Amino acid sequence: PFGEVFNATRFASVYAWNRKRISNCVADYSVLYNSASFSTFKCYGVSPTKLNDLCFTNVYADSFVIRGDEVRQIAPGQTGKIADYNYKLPDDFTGCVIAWNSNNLDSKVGGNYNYLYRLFRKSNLKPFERDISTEIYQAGSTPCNGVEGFNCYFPLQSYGFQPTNGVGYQPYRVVVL
């Protein structure tokens, strides 16, 4: 196992979620819930106390930083902006998703423009898919032609994390399995 994922100094962006693998090693999913104070450990399929006893190459860790109000979207069957346009879990999702607040790290006076999220897309994301397209999203009957205006929007919006914002408008950080 490794801890440089959760204790990473730089996290990913939602639309460009960063995946990490772990194999030919041993993973202890119990003591993970010790360096914790985790505000979320939503879990579908089997309890981590029981899953501590087997392991393929299934060991995957997806890291990124979302919006507070949006943490509920990293869940099977949910819709919205992140689920349809950034990170879609399957319906066969067997794993866990861990989250915690991080406003003292990913927030700035004047907003933090490093973390972005996809806001438009021609079709919903198939499960476990990563789309880094930056093309002007055609909203109406008009080919845009590399120019923004009414309709034809830039698809990636910035979170602009300020500390004065509410807890829903606050940063976070997610995991996978």
Partner: antibody, heavy 113, light 112 residues
Framework: QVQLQQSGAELVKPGASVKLSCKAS????????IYWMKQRPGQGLEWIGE????????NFNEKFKSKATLTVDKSSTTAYMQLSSLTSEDSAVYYC??????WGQGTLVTVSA | DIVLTQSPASLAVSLGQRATISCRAS??????????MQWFQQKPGQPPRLLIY???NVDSGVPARFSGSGSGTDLSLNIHPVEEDDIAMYFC?????????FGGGTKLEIKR
């Protein structure tokens, strides 16, 4: 910052033509389509005719007779609209806008002898 | 030419309250998953600024106090904590069919 400096506050004799300028700053001139809007006190906002700072433009049949939109891609980074044969229904405030953010200050044209 | 009819034409609300204005369109301003509506705000003596684009998305520099809702033919602009600087005219504008059309407006004045 993103700025749309319009000229204007212009007296135009009835029946003549006028050319309103709008200089853009703080953003790349070619990535953002530019729209021109008409507002007369009493009436609401009216019509969005656009120029794509790269040839193409599109107007409204209501203005497809008195409105001619052009632009200087060069160091001007300035969008121009020419109004032709100005009647008293043409005196108003005209805005250039970027589809996002604040509009230009607005040029007030007054058609009087 | 879709006709945009705003209601009410004049709304008075108190500091901190919620203000809601609505915009009816003769036709549906929806297209292939997006509602092509925009909300503009013109303070007294200022040029209009874009508040809302694509019916429900907020533009940069606009506080979260403004929200956009509705569907296809009937749209709504909401202000959850009305602050003292919101005194302005509010225009709805459509963009599914050229010509782009505007609404009549809505003067928002504040009770004190």
């Amino acid at each position: 910052q993103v700025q749309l400096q319009q000229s204007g506050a212009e007296l135009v004799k009835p029946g003549a033509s006028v050319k309103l300028s709008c200089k853009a700053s703080g953003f790349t001139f070619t990535r953002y389509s530019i729209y021109w809007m008409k507002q007369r006190p009493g009436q609401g906002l009216e019509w969005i005719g656009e120029i794509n700072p790269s040839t193409g433009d599109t107007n409204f049949n209501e203005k497809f007779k008195s409105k001619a939109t052009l632009t200087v891609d060069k160091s001007s980074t300035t969008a121009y609209m020419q109004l032709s044969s100005l009647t008293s229904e043409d005196s108003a405030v005209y805005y250039c806008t970027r589809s996002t953010g604040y509009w230009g200050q607005g040029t007030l044209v007054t058609v009087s002898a | 030419d879709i006709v945009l009819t705003q209601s009410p034409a004049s709304l008075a609300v108190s500091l901190g309250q919620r203000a809601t204005i609505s915009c009816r369109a003769s036709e549906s301003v929806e297209y292939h998953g997006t509602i092509l509506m925009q909300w503009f705000q013109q303070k007294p003596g200022q040029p209009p600024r874009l508040l809302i684009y694509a019916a429900s998305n907020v533009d940069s520099g606009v506080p979260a106090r403004f929200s956009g809702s509705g569907s296809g033919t009937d749209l709504s602009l909401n202000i959850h904590p009305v602050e003292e600087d919101d005194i302005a005219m509010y225009f709805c504008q459509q963009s599914r069919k050229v010509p782009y059309t505007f609404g009549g407006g809505t003067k928002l004045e504040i009770k004190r």
